[PDB]
Ligand binder design. Sequence first.
Ligand code: HEM
Ligand SMILES: *[C@@H]1O[C@H](CO)[C@@H](O[C@@H]2O[C@H](CO)[C@@H](O[C@@H]3O[C@H](CO)[C@@H](O)[C@H](O)[C@@H]3O)[C@H](O)[C@H]2NC(C)=O)[C@H](O)[C@H]1NC(C)=O
Ligand SMILES: *[C@@H]1O[C@H](CO)[C@@H](O[C@@H]2O[C@H](CO)[C@@H](O[C@H]3O[C@H](CO)[C@@H](O)[C@H](O)[C@@H]3O)[C@H](O)[C@H]2NC(C)=O)[C@H](O)[C@H]1NC(C)=O
Ligand SMILES: *[C@@H]1O[C@H](CO)[C@@H](O[C@@H]2O[C@H](CO)[C@@H](O)[C@H](O)[C@H]2NC(C)=O)[C@H](O)[C@H]1NC(C)=O
Ligand SMILES: *[C@@H]1O[C@H](CO)[C@@H](O[C@@H]2O[C@H](CO)[C@@H](O)[C@H](O)[C@H]2NC(C)=O)[C@H](O)[C@H]1NC(C)=O
Ligand code: CA
Length: 595
Amino acid sequence: SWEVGCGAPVPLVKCDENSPYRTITGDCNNRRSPALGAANRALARWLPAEYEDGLALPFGWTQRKTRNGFRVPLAREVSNKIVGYLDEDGVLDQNRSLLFMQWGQIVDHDLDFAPETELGSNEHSKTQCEEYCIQGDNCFPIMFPKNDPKLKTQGKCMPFFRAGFVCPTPPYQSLAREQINAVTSFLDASLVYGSEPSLASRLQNLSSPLGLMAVNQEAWDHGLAYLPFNNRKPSPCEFINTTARVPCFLAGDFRASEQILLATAHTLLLREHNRLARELKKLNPQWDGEKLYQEARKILGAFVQIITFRDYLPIVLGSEMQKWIPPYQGYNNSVDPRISNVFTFAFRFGHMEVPSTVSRLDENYQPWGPEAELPLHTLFFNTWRIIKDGGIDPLVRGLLAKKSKLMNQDKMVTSELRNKLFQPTHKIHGFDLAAINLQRCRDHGMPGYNSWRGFCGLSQPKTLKGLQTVLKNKILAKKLMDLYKTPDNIDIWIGGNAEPMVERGRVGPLLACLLGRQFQQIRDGDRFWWENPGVFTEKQRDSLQKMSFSRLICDNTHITKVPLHAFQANNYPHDFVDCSAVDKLDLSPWASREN
Ligand code: HEM
Ligand SMILES: *[C@@H]1O[C@H](CO)[C@@H](O[C@@H]2O[C@H](CO)[C@@H](O[C@@H]3O[C@H](CO)[C@@H](O)[C@H](O)[C@@H]3O)[C@H](O)[C@H]2NC(C)=O)[C@H](O)[C@H]1NC(C)=O
Ligand SMILES: *[C@@H]1O[C@H](CO)[C@@H](O[C@@H]2O[C@H](CO)[C@@H](O[C@H]3O[C@H](CO)[C@@H](O)[C@H](O)[C@@H]3O)[C@H](O)[C@H]2NC(C)=O)[C@H](O)[C@H]1NC(C)=O
Ligand SMILES: *[C@@H]1O[C@H](CO)[C@@H](O[C@@H]2O[C@H](CO)[C@@H](O)[C@H](O)[C@H]2NC(C)=O)[C@H](O)[C@H]1NC(C)=O
Ligand SMILES: *[C@@H]1O[C@H](CO)[C@@H](O[C@@H]2O[C@H](CO)[C@@H](O)[C@H](O)[C@H]2NC(C)=O)[C@H](O)[C@H]1NC(C)=O
Ligand SMILES: [Ca+2]
């Protein structure tokens, strides 16, 4: 049996072969099958999907349906018993800057987004779901287990809506349900430019032929650009402080305002596009408005890639880097560049790297003002602290000089995210990202832990003693067993994250494998990979190889002191040097010598 057909919600457009620029949607990257790695299509299944009813119901939907003969435990109950911790002392990655957490979220955002199903704005699937906690259709509420303190203050559940799926977004009934990636699978700064035409243009400055992205005309940062604000009302950035009335930003990606440091990095990207475009017109004064946009956008895309594969992945994998991402050997069109459904959970290792507070630091890197450090939760959907506090600048210094959270088998996810998450259609700082992630694993039909162990050539523990051995942790294993009753039922997010953290890396073996494999394909199956012969000239590639996040900071802020290796843990002033000492990006090689 088999089904190749289904790809109905897609406008299938021309591929201008030889074009030297990526499309916005990601179509036409791969020539044999030009929908490969395009946005708005069904994420890839490395392993057949696993639902309660074979088709679409997330294990845990039916109380009289076991998984392998055992009920699956409530997501919130796994959160409470395994994921949570009280004492934030001692949980600071000694050798990773806070930038390390933040880049990961940036890369994640470039690569995947599975939007909640939306059949109703003015429809009571939302209200009935939130108010009365009745599971049905796309309402899959996260129920509190006996003894939960949120029972006392928040109700019977936290709302949760099932992710969008292809074919139709009303129910289906032939193939297994397949969730959508709404963004492009190819690491191509789609978070900045958008993955759809409608937005990419709306993002553009089509008032002038300079190839610039649209900037805030309401607020400014020492004459440095801010991102435009967004249309949407209701606005959750507004709802955060209804007095200040500062809305969310508008970026290539809709999540850019989830937290202030994400919105900051987005700032650390729009700026550079425009810097790059201005420098480019200055040099090639005959170039189109379009041409300037595309060639900046190309260089930016190349920056995301280089920072990611040269600086980030080596330190997020460790020992396994070489085992899954051998040095580049060219473009391979037989490679599938699609983001897999499991990767979208594996990449959520980042959630254990988020610490409980964010600092603003002045130019001696000392607290900035009387409220320099804030609880992370007061910063979900918070632009106003950017616009009417300090710059971006103090936050970027914090990104450099403060540390990531270290994942810890006994202190997984800070309560800032585990109890205080703010959703943008629900009025409280009262949600649990960990619960949500577990529920979503089930929503998405994920195979369990041991299925992924087996996929990656690793042992598949069956017996509580065997699980202790894999996780080198008696007590964690015990709680996992007590709750799941068989490692085969352990949800991939929590299983993958429970494994000790490799060597020199920040993920376990199961994750290294899932992540390495996805990034290898991201790298090998992209026709516009920066390092693919043809995409850039050898000259051009000699200039791009010197880019650095440091350099990005220098050219787009008024920070004049940065470390050389920004992802590592760095302290001021010892690990910092002046922007003078820090390599520039030399665009001589972009000179259009059509003569
Ligand atoms: C708030 C949130 C963060 C920080 C303050 C945060 C951080 C990260 C990092 C650092 C990631 C990678 C290193 C990462 C990956 C992914 N996240 Fe996550 N994250 C915050 C909040 C959320 C929320 C909310 C979601 C949606 C949850 C849902 O299932 O309903 C979320 C998701 C993800 C995600 C899946 C994205 C997708 O493909 O749709 C990651 C890969 N994060 N986060
Ligand atoms: C903190 O983690 C850093 C990385 O953030 C650790 O050091 C990294 O380890 C690599 C080895 O793979 C080193 O890179 C090597 O350096 C030589 C030149 O001496 C160069 O030819 C290559 O680039 C080579 O890979 C390097 O020390 C470092 N890498 C980077 C990018 O910083 C470090 O061990 C940890 N720091 C502390 C204080 O423990
Ligand atoms: C909602 O946003 C408000 C800003 O839009 C914020 O209030 C701001 O923060 C403090 C509160 O006093 C003020 O900072 C200083 O203001 C002047 C300095 O010129 C001093 O008189 C004060 O003592 C103070 O140090 C901001 O000026 C202030 N602005 C306003 C209009 O109050 C709120 O705190 C935000 N509220 C929430 C719940 O997030
Ligand atoms: C689109 O670009 C035009 C041309 O630069 C912008 O107009 C400039 O705006 C800046 C402030 O943003 C001021 O110097 C002048 O108003 C214009 N400068 C020049 C040299 O003409 C316009 O702001 C941009 N529009 C948007 C919405 O970003
Ligand atoms: C591109 O990648 C694919 C991986 O799927 C390679 O194709 C496989 O190559 C191995 C060894 O030659 C064979 O055993 C497989 O059966 C091949 N499968 C297919 C579909 O071709 C391919 O060799 C790689 N190409 C390059 C140039 O590296
Ligand atoms: Ca992308």
